[PDB]
């Protein structure tokens, strides 16, 4: 699969909100907002999965810096979180 890291999420963005923003893009599979399992609070980022690399690439480019709940989406290829 081909996976996007979606950053700069408003802490009020839940799974439903994130999924609704990406649901209709070609090859979309799923979306999840990350939250701190010791507090329950959103980490302000999430992931969106696709069957196709080209389709994940286009969804990223289409949504890059677009506003969701007042905050610009900061999108990149999913990768190990640093530091």
């Amino acid at each position: 699969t081909f996976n996007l890291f979606v950053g700069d999420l408003n802490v009020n963005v839940d799974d439903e909100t994130l999924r609704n923003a990406f649901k209709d893009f070609p090859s979309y599979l799923s979306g999840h907002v990350m939250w701190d399992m010791q507090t329950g609070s959103s980490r302000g980022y999430g992931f969106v999965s696709f069957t196709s690399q080209d389709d994940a690439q286009n969804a990223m480019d289409s949504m890059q810096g677009q506003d969701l709940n007042g905050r610009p989406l900061r999108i990149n290829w999913a990768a190990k979180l640093e530091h």
Side-chain angles (χ1 to χ4, degrees):
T1 61
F2 296 89
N3 305 120
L4 303 179
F5 176 95
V6 180
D8 191 39
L9 298 180
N10 194 317
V11 289
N12 77 356
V13 168
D14 54 9
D15 284 346
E16 185 187 340
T17 301
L18 177 67
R19 287 156 184 172
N20 280 353
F22 292 87
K23 258 215 271 78
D24 299 310
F25 282 98
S27 297
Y28 167 89
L29 285 170
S30 54
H32 297 94
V33 175
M34 304 306 288
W35 53 280
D36 181 329
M37 290 189 172
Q38 291 185 94
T39 70
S41 66
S42 178
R43 294 202 180 267
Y45 57 83
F47 296 99
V48 180
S49 186
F50 297 81
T51 68
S52 159
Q53 188 186 343
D54 288 349
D55 287 332
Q57 181 75 55
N58 293 332
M60 167 160 47
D61 294 329
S62 204
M63 298 296 274
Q64 189 69 84
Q66 306 288 174
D67 276 4
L68 176 63
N69 291 11
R71 297 273 287 280
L73 294 160
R74 301 300 181 203
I75 309 171
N76 58 256
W77 288 111
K80 187 187 196 198
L81 305 181
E82 307 165 14
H83 311 117

